[PDB]
Amino acid sequence: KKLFLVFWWHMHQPLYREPYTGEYLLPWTFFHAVKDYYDMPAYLKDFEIKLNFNLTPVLIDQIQEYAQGKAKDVFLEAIRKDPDDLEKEEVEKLIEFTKLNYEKPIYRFERIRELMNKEKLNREELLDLQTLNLLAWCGRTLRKDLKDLLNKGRNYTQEEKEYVLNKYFEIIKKTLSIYREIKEEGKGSVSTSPYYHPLIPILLNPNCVYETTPNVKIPDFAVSFREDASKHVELAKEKYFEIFGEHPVYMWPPQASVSNEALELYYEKGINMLATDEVILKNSVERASPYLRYYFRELISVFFRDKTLSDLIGFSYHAWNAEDAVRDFIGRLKKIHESVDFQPVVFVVLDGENCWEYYEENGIPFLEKLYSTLEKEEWIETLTLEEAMRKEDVKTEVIESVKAGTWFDGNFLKWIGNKEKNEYWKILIEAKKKAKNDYILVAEGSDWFWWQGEEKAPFVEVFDKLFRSFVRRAQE
Ligand SMILES: OC[C@H]1O[C@H](O[C@H]2[C@H](O)[C@@H](O)[C@@H](O[C@H]3[C@H](O)[C@@H](O)[C@@H](O[C@H]4[C@H](O)[C@@H](O)[C@@H](O[C@H]5[C@H](O)[C@@H](O)[C@@H](O)O[C@@H]5CO)O[C@@H]4CO)O[C@@H]3CO)O[C@@H]2CO)[C@H](O)[C@@H](O)[C@@H]1O
Ligand SMILES: OC[C@H]1O[C@H](O[C@H]2[C@H](O)[C@@H](O)[C@@H](O[C@H]3[C@H](O)[C@@H](O)[C@@H](O[C@H]4[C@H](O)[C@@H](O)[C@@H](O)O[C@@H]4CO)O[C@@H]3CO)O[C@@H]2CO)[C@H](O)[C@@H](O)[C@@H]1O
């Protein structure tokens, strides 16, 4: 009697490439590529477990651009430059970026503390600010190779900065290949999402917000996004075919978002299985065990993730010692294992690149201890998505209807509802009336609405600039 454990790490970035200048206006795709996107599947090289991954096609596009040397990244150019050639604006954006990440454990360098107490920086101090920002995002693989430079902590030269950059781009160049390798070796399944990570339920039927938040105000959806919804899925199938050689049979719905109509569309497009959130299941069915494989209308397989276990990694364990956190995690799986007489399937699903920056040492002590302890447990069998879809000694249930929602409170309020987010949908709706190319699909990505209508934060202007630029470009 085994507990079946399914890790599904979801990787995504919206398109930071501004369509008129061709410039990557934020460096987040680069920094999460060198820190997490290669290194997360790379754990499978050292640990005999199964781990699954989601790669959005818009993320894949940017990884390709960086890997091929075509990405003009404005922040990264400020990093690469000799400090004597830095513009005042570039120094300000460098300092701004440091302040934003300053309290995170991966930025725990004494020299960063010294430099941010300084009101004017010379060439050597700017070289340290540039290079330590690079090194703060160093992933597990290169933290071994670059350990001498990392322990330095200060006094970096342009030659050393350039060396780190060359190693980082080598990491990026091998990133798509290692997803292909762990997939071909059976160490994990790889899924994708509709192309630009949109909210498929809203594009299909904006009225589905009223299944959870009946009081919410939405704009006049005077155009249909239903065909655009199909296009996100179809284009995603094409990009996945290019990278991995098959049409995808697993998809992660952006924000875990599902509806009766969205599940229909996924089935119609040949998706055999997806996962969503436990809150959906609780909102939809009275007797709701998340340890079963569900069949929506006998059309498509649905797993409901263990929200508690997913939220321990995403939200709790960063503030713990690695050893305490893994003993807690295994202790919870043991109680699940001891709680039922059948073999439960336990889906752990969350973003794969966003939580580790808040852990000590980028979560490497935690994940190494976690994966080491998992592979020693005889009563735990980690599964690929393919193995979870096919496993016969697993309990099964049919569900006929779900309440539309997301894994954020089970509703859509993080992307629609208040004046400012609704203004984005107004802009999108008007632009869709006049759209002439697929940049309208880029503007349907969920990220733009997430950051809109929120307390002012540094760089929120860039997401707004990107969204409006994609909207403008879509109509030309
Ligand atoms: O404002 C108060 C608030 O601020 C702080 O949050 C800030 C972060 O700490 C800071 O680093 C920065 O966040 C960045 C982020 O680091 C950067 O990587 C990028 O985020 C990407 C994700 O990396 C990417 O995975 C994707 O995220 C999706 C995800 O795929 C999906 O599954 C789901 O979870 O939604 C996510 C969002 O759509 O895309 C995003 C970009 O859209 O960009 C971020 C913004 O610059 O800035 C944050 C805001 O200031 C504190 O951390 C927080 O506690 C404070 O309360
Ligand atoms: O900025 C603060 C935090 O940043 C990081 O958190 C990330 C997570 O890593 C991502 O996975 C994602 O979080 C998802 C989350 O996985 C999903 O379960 C859901 O979580 C709900 C949760 O059930 C609920 O109980 C409550 O705690 O709020 C969550 C949000 O409603 O939805 C999340 C949003 O997509 O993104 C967050 C950042 O938003 C980092 O890991 C944290 O340490 C950090 O505090």
* Ligand 1 atom at shortest distance from the alpha carbon of 354: 23
Query: Which ligand has the shortest distance to the CA of 413?
Result: 2
How far apart CA 438 and CA 70 sit, in angstroms, is 21
Strand 300-304 relative to strand 293-296, pairing: antiparallel
Centre of ligand 1 to C-alpha 252, Å, is: 19
DSSP codes, 267-328: HHTT--EEEE-HHHHHHH-SS--TTSEEEETTTEEEEE--HHHHHIIIIIGGGS-HHHHHHH
Residue 112 tokens, joined: 């960063």
How far apart CA 49 and CA 353 sit, in angstroms, is 19
User: Which residues form ligand 2's pocket by a CB distance below 6 Å?
Assistant: 307, 310-311, 314-315, 318, 350-351, 354-355, 358, 407-409
- Side-chain half-sphere CA neighbours of 73 within 13 A: 22
Reading phi first (left if > 0) and then psi (alpha if -120 to 50, else beta), residue 207 is in: alpha
User: Which residues form ligand 1's pocket by a CB distance below 6 Å?
Assistant: 10, 12-14, 28, 32, 100, 255, 351, 353-354, 446-447, 450, 455, 457, 459
| From 9, 93, 354, mutation site for ligand 1 pocket: most ligand atoms within 8 A of C-beta | 354
| Closest to 96 measured CA to CA, from 75, 69, 81 | 75
* Ligand 1 atom at shortest distance from the alpha carbon of 446: 38
| Closest to 248 measured CA to CA, from 65, 397, 53 | 53
Centre of ligand 1 to C-alpha 336, Å, is: 32
Whether the Cβ atoms of residue 460 and residue 454 lie closer than 8 Å to each other:
yes
Kindly give, in sequence order, each residue whose CB lies less than 8 Å from that of residue 124, ignoring residues fewer than 6 positions away: 155
Question: For the chain, which residues make up each domain, given as ranges?
Answer: 70-168
Phi then psi for residue 194, to 5 deg, are -50, 145
Tell me how the structure was determined: X-ray
How far apart CA 212 and CA 36 sit, in angstroms, is 34
Resolution in A: 1.9
List C-alpha distances in Å: 363 to 214, 356, 422: 40, 5, 37
| From 354, 454, 455, mutation site for ligand 2 pocket: most ligand atoms within 8 A of C-beta | 354
Cβ-count burial of 284 within 10 angstroms (0-12 exposed, 13-18 middle, 19+ buried)?
buried
Phi then psi for residue 454, to 5 deg, are -130, 165
**What 8-state DSSP symbol labels residue 34?**
I
